[PDB]
């Protein structure tokens, strides 16, 4: 029997997902990969899938209707609107090349702090939030195939989950309630100096299609 699958270089991403502890079901908008470059050698380390409520986020982005995928990815304002949009969002991250949690966490945290410090939005509250974020990854190992779940039930709140085998948890492990960190983390992936332009392209064409 036939099945429809979404894949990024063979890594399978479900077309819809229900975040840990959530009732809602989110729809995949697009997916790409985060690739680290050494010399002229490119290493893919993670696959990233971006999910949200399709009708709702389509409604909030209606000013971009009929705008082409080519035109959206060219425009930082669209991605600002996508990041700001007050809808549930989820990032599913599948580890390609294994690594230790404190490494991934450390790098992402530094990226966030850089963004927030640049914006003059880094105080003790953010440091504590990032303490939580840091502590979450400190204790864990991220082997190939393990998956991280970043859940934004609203733009101000971040919920983190993780499964070593790639299955879907039914409740979140960590909650970071800090608007700046939550938004910055989303900005790591969909923002101006994205760790994954491919993911942004994929989301752009998905959203363009969705409108
Ligand atoms: Cl990543």
Ligand 1 center–CA 209 separation, angstroms:
25
Ligand 1 center–CA 131 separation, angstroms:
19
Together in a domain, 117 and 107: yes
Query: Are 22 and 88 spatial neighbours (Cβ–Cβ below 8 Å)?
Result: yes
Together in a domain, 198 and 103: no
Ligand 1 center–CA 137 separation, angstroms:
13
Together in a domain, 69 and 146: no
- Among 197, 208, 209, 210, which residue's Cα sits nearest to residue 31? 197
Ligand 1 center–CA 106 separation, angstroms:
12
Together in a domain, 113 and 43: yes
Rg (CA), the chain: 16
Together in a domain, 146 and 71: no
Query: Are 160 and 178 spatial neighbours (Cβ–Cβ below 8 Å)?
Result: no
Domain carrying residue 68: 56-84+190-211
Together in a domain, 113 and 197: no
Ligand 1 center–CA 18 separation, angstroms:
20
Ligand 1 center–CA 170 separation, angstroms:
22
Ligand 1 center–CA 44 separation, angstroms:
10
173 vs 169: CA distance, rounded Å: 9
DSSP 155: T
SS3 at position 159: strand
DSSP string for 24-53: --EEEEEEEEEEEEETTEEEEEEEEEEEE-
Report the domain count for the chain.
2
Ligand 1 center–CA 94 separation, angstroms:
8
Ligand 1 center–CA 162 separation, angstroms:
13
Ligand 1 center–CA 1 separation, angstroms:
34
Query: Are 78 and 72 spatial neighbours (Cβ–Cβ below 8 Å)?
Result: yes
Ligand 1 center–CA 116 separation, angstroms:
18
Expressed in Å, this structure's resolution amounts to 2.4
Together in a domain, 17 and 67: no
Together in a domain, 91 and 65: no
Ligand 1 center–CA 208 separation, angstroms:
23
Together in a domain, 77 and 47: no
Angle between helices 124-138 and 101-118 (to 10 degrees): 160
Ligand 1 center–CA 146 separation, angstroms:
12
Together in a domain, 71 and 158: no
Experimental method: X-ray
Together in a domain, 171 and 77: no
Q: What is the dihedral of CA 103, 108, 114, 115, to 10 degrees?
A: 180
Query: Are 6 and 12 spatial neighbours (Cβ–Cβ below 8 Å)?
Result: yes
């Amino acid at each position: 029997m036939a099945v429809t699958k979404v894949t990024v270089d063979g890594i399978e991403f479900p077309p819809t997902i229900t975040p840990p502890g959530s009732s809602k079901s989110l729809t995949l908008l697009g997916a790409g990969v985060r690739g680290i470059e050494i010399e002229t050698i490119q290493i893919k380390v993670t696959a990233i899938g971006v999910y949200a409520e399709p009708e709702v986020i389509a409604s909030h982005l209606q000013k971009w209707k009929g705008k082409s995928a080519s035109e959206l990815v060219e425009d930082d304002g669209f991605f600002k609107d996508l990041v700001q949009a007050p809808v549930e969002k989820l990032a599913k991250i599948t580890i390609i090349k294994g690594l230790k949690g404190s490494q991934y966490g450390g790098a992402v945290e530094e990226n966030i702090r850089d963004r927030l410090a640049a914006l003059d939005k880094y105080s003790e509250a953010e440091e504590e939030a990032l303490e939580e974020f840091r502590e979450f990854f400190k204790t864990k190992s991220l082997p190939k195939g393990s998956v991280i779940f970043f859940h934004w039930p609203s733009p101000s709140t971040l919920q983190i989950s993780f499964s070593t085998d790639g299955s879907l948890p039914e409740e979140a492990e960590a909650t970071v309630e800090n608007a700046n960190v939550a938004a910055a983390l989303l900005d790591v992936f969909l923002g101006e100096n994205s760790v994954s332009p491919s993911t942004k392209a994929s989301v752009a064409e998905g959203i363009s299609a969705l409108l």
